[PDB]
């Protein structure tokens, strides 16, 4: 499980 | 293994039971799988996080404001505060309430605050500034079961520091930002609520950590702190800096450290107060002293460049006469008294927000037919002042010693002779009515009056407000007497020394003390 | 293991099929996983949730009316909502129609409302304050979770700031707590975290606010109740009683070196503070005691520090602002009429000026076109009753007049003042003084008719406050007599009017 910030 | 810094650390013992079980948790898997560095990296947080090591607050008084008065020089109320502070936590452990907040316009010094308030209370120093931030990650970090995960910066400034009980100078509130999936507006509600300091609940660190000792002093240019934030918080609004005290932050603060910044030795360079006050005067407007930090260091850069291309001279002396020659022609200019009486022209007295000054109310009658025109970017309050003045002098005529007829055959123009700057208010009320009498009647106002006061139909000078940009900005121009409505003499006892000693003022109740006054012959 | 844990609490049959099934779940998989951490987790938040155990609620008005005043002074009218509705929860065991709301300004005590009513009604006390499981850890959901943390099966639920909480943005819709607020969706309320339908019946909801700018589907089940502000003698009582004990215990002062008098907070109250609530005169009182403290470690001679009415210019600064007062010193060609605001209530002089000229009419004073109507409509009721009045009826075209109110830079507006201005015309017109102890109000029409008025109540504290002995009324405002406080109807000799002849006779010294 790894976070990944959108827009 | 480590048990000795888990057992060392004196943890509380949720945070203890928890770190043991997740040491018996990594005592029997493979140091090298993914878990194992997830909960050895955790483990490495709860250590270095600082749960009991706590610092001294300082007690005593007299000693805390000399560590308070030889950074800044004159935020008395703001120093004055911290020096009740001191004085409650002298009986209390942990204060209660709202934190401290330090409202300013720029260049104030409300950030450069933080390292005093820090000495003045033996606390250690933390800085956290809040200008661009989106997301709650940064107040609350992510969970354990991320790849990279951490805890917020507050956890790790805590840690970064290593002793509770900081200081903290949250540094811009009100320049925070909004976003999707967090807001770290609402976390840092949860870091400023007396009920929630003793539980946090990082997510990183699913403890809960105790924030009830951490001072709290942040800051802001304005009241745009957001309604969940500011009912939690005490403003102190620094307002600007008097010419006086600004050549005191000048001569005591700016000159020194702006030698060393540029690296002046010692006699090549020398500027005295009088190239300051032509600094403050005629070269700067703002409030603050950034702008005068940055024309003294112009002033030392200019001096280097004329000594290492000289080498002639080896001292420079700047007055109030050669300042032109370095900073060039003087950028702005105040008002300043009359050298005679006029026949149609009062001195009104202006408040903006960095300061005061003197304005000139120029009235001339003609004959001819009733008429009556306002010029000089009047505001409707002026402008309704100036015609409530007009009926003023319209009653009372004959005892005057007007011809009362006087409005169906002259023609009167009221200009304030700026032009371009729009003035509005009422306090220039009375100064505005003798004018109108003075070309009524040929009396000459005398040139060493200011007048400032709203007008009523039957004659009496209701209060004004910002009194002391008025007099600090009348007592520069040269004025002598200043005429004040009688129920703002209690604002008298705010006044520096010199300025009540130098003034002749005096508290008016109707409008015939202000025409035995202000005008040169009786009425 | 913990099924002694799970039938210990004797959860409903629905959960502890969920429940022993993840039990029969946890039997077939490893113990120091993660996943298994996930299962641990999600039997403990359900052995947290109360499914049991209520608090017996109180039926008696009494002792909920004390301990209703034990905390909070003057909100009788809400008082008596909750009693009422204690009343009908005493009967009916189960109210699931509307919710109480409470709208008023910021500073009234709406949110410790929350405090009396919890331990005044006996349940326990969870304010929310608005403005699934997988593999990464999730907890419950907030509504949920606040039941859990209280442990209760009938805990007293707060919504607070609901004008706060819907903002501009894209945040939480109407929807999940319309679904807690109406009465058949209660039933069955299944938590995304935990899948089981719990039940909200039985739970009591209080919502505050400081508008009524509510979304549409949740005002439809609020009940707005008003919160009116504070009047001078309820401050004073508010700070003597409630407000200077907490700032001594947060400041532990110990109660032989410092005595705030009532001239001290009477002073705060009318010279150094202009809001609706208490909250400002908090921040004064806690500047006063700080600077107590201060003045006691600084100075060990003087123990016991005296602060009255003199000696507030020493401490907390200068007078910030300033009321109006009765200028009964003379009575000249000028009223003295009432002005009605949120902070309070306001004397309001209102002067003429009428010179010989051609008749221009000038009104002065950031006026709002009502009130200029208002002194059109008083002009022409002087124009038709010139001749008895005893006026040269040529004074339209003989004489300019000019109508100012002093405090400029102060927006006015309002329909009200109206026969004060005629009382002001007729007394500059005819030379006849106007009586400075007599305060007006009202609304004239050209016929000569008094109109009513609105917030009669703080037009007479400021007459109360000011000096005023007479007060002229509209004589349909008698009505509102009847919430005056009767120290304020023994000083004031209020006189109903219903025509200009019963105030030109009253407000004039000598008569017309
Ligand atoms: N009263 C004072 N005495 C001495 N120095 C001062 C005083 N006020 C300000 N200064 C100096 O001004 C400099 C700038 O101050 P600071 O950076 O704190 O301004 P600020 O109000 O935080 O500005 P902003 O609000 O834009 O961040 C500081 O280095 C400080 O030394
Ligand atoms: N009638 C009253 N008696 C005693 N204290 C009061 C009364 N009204 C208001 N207060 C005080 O004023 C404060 C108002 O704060 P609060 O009501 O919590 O915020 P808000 O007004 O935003 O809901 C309370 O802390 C309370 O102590
Ligand atoms: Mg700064």
Redesign the interface.
């Given at each position: 499980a790894a976070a990944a910030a959108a827009a | 293994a480590l048990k000795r810094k888990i057992e060392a650390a004196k943890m509380p013992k949720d945070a203890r039971e928890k770190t043991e079980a997740e040491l018996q948790?990594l005592k029997?898997?493979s140091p090298m799988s993914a878990?194992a560095t997830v909960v050895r990296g955790y483990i490495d947080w709860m250590l270095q996080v600082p749960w009991n090591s706590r610092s001294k607050v300082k007690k005593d008084?007299v000693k805390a404001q000399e560590v308070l008065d030889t950074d800044h020089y004159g935020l008395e109320r703001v120093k004055?505060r911290i020096?009740?502070?001191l004085?409650?936590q002298?009986?209390?452990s942990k204060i209660?309430?709202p934190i401290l907040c330090l409202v300013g316009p720029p260049g104030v010094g409300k950030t450069s605050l933080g390292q005093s308030i820090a000495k003045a209370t033996g606390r250690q120093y933390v800085r956290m500034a809040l200008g661009g931030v989106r997301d709650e990650a940064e107040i609350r970090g992510?969970?354990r079961?991320?790849?990279?995960?951490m805890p917020g910066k507050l956890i790790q400034k805590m840690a970064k520091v290593g002793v509770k009980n900081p200081l903290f100078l949250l540094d811009q509130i009100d320049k925070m930002a909004?976003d999707?999936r967090g807001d770290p507006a609402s976390a840092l509600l949860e870091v400023l609520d007396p009920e929630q300091n003793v539980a946090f609940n990082d997510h990183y660190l699913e403890v809960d950590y105790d924030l009830s000792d951490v001072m709290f002093v942040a800051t802001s240019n304005s009241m745009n702190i957001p309604?969940?934030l500011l009912?939690r918080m005490?403003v102190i609004r620094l307002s600007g800096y008097t010419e006086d005290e600004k050549l005191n932050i000048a001569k005591q603060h700016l000159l020194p450290k702006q030698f060393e910044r540029n690296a002046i030795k010692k006699g090549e360079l020398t500027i005295d107060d009088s190239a300051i006050m032509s600094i403050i005067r005629y070269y700067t407007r703002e409030a603050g002293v950034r702008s005068l930090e940055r024309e003294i260091s112009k002033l030392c850069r200019k001096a280097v460049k004329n000594l290492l291309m000289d080498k002639t001279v080896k001292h420079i002396e700047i007055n109030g006469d050669n300042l032109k020659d370095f900073l060039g022609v003087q950028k702005v200019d105040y008002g300043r008294a009359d050298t005679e009486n006029r026949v149609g022209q009062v001195t009104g007295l202006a408040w903006t927000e960095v300061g005061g000054d003197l304005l000139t109310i120029e009235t001339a009658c003609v004959p001819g037919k009733?008429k009556l025109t306002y010029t000089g970017s009047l505001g409707?309050?002026m402008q309704?002042?100036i015609?409530?003045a007009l009926?003023v002098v319209?009653?009372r005529a004959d005892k005057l010693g007007i011809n009362?007829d006087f409005?169906?055959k002259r023609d009167i123009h009221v200009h304030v002779p700026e032009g371009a700057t729009p003035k509005?208010?009422?306090s220039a009320?009375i100064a505005m009515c003798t004018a109108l009498v003075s070309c009524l009647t040929g009396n000459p106002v005398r040139a060493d009056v200011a007048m400032t006061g709203?007008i009523?139909?039957?004659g009496?000078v209701?209060?004004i407000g910002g009194l002391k940009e008025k007099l600090l900005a009348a007592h520069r121009g040269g004025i002598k007497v200043v005429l004040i409505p009688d129920?703002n003499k209690?604002?008298l006892?705010?006044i520096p020394d010199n300025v009540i000693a130098d003034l002749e003022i005096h508290p008016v109740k109707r409008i015939d003390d202000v025409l035995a006054i202000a005008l040169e012959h009786p009425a």
């Open positions: - | 948790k029997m898997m878990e008084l004055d020096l009740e502070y004085a409650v002298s009986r209390v209660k309430g992510h969970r079961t991320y790849i990279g995960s909004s999707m309604a969940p009912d005490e009733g409707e309050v309704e002042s015609q409530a009926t319209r009653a009362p409005y169906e509005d208010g009422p009320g709203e009523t139909l039957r009496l209701l209060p129920d209690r604002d006892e705010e």
